[PDB]
Design brief:
Blueprint: E1 5-6, E2 12-13, H1 42-45
Antiparallel strand pairs: 1-2
PDB class: rna binding protein
Keywords: Nop10p, RNA binding protein
Assembly: monomeric
Length: about 55
């Protein structure tokens, strides 16, 4: 009928453990990274950044 477990010396320890699990359930459907396609990258959209021109005659 005790609501606490004693130690090897006689020290009381509140360990009713009435409930099975004792933890805060994390929220589901968390915000996952957005990336449905490869075009998502701003770099892919940006024009050629190589500037490989050939000025001359």
């Amino acid at each position: 009928h005790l609501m606490y477990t004693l130690g090897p010396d006689g020290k009381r320890i509140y360990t009713l453990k009435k409930v099975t699990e004792s933890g805060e359930i994390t929220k589901s459907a968390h915000p996952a990274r957005f990336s449905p396609d490869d075009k998502y990258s701003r770099q892919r959209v940006t024009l050629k950044k190589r500037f490989g021109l050939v000025p001359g005659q």
